C-alpha cells in the first residue's frame, strides 16, 4: 500500500492478460489481493515440478474456506475456478519444452 507501482503489481497484470487468453475473467485487483494474502500469512513460495501454483492456491483455498465463511472475502472462492484453467495452461506447458 505504501507503494502505488511495485514490480508484484506488473506480474499480476501480464497474468491477467495472459491467462485471459485461457478463458479466466478475474480482476487485476483481486489477484493483486491473492498474491498478497499468501505472503501474508505465507512468505514463502516452494517451487517443484509439479504445478508450482498448486501449493500456492493450496494455502488460499484452505484459509479462504474459513475466511469465507468468517466474512474476509479478500480472497473470493472464484479463484478456484480460474484456476481450472492455469492447470490446463501449465499443464500444456510442461509438454514440448520450448525456449525463446
Given at each position: 500500500m505504501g507503494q502505488e507501482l511495485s514490480q508484484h503489481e506488473r506480474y499480476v497484470e501480464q497474468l491477467k492478460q495472459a491467462l485471459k487468453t485461457r478463458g479466466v475473467k478475474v480482476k487485476y485487483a483481486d489477484l493483486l489481493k491473492f498474491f498478497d494474502f499468501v505472503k501474508d500469512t505465507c512468505p514463502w513460495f516452494p517451487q517443484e515440478?509439479?504445478?508450482?501454483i498448486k501449493r500456492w492456491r493450496r494455502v488460499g483455498d484452505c484459509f479462504q474456506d474459513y475466511y469465507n465463511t468468517f466474512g474476509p472475502e479478500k480472497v473470493p472462492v472464484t479463484a478456484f475456478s480460474y484456476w481450472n484453467l492455469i492447470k490446463e495452461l501449465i499443464d500444456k506447458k510442461e509438454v514440448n519444452p520450448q525456449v525463446m
Open positions: 515440478g509439479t504445478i508450482d
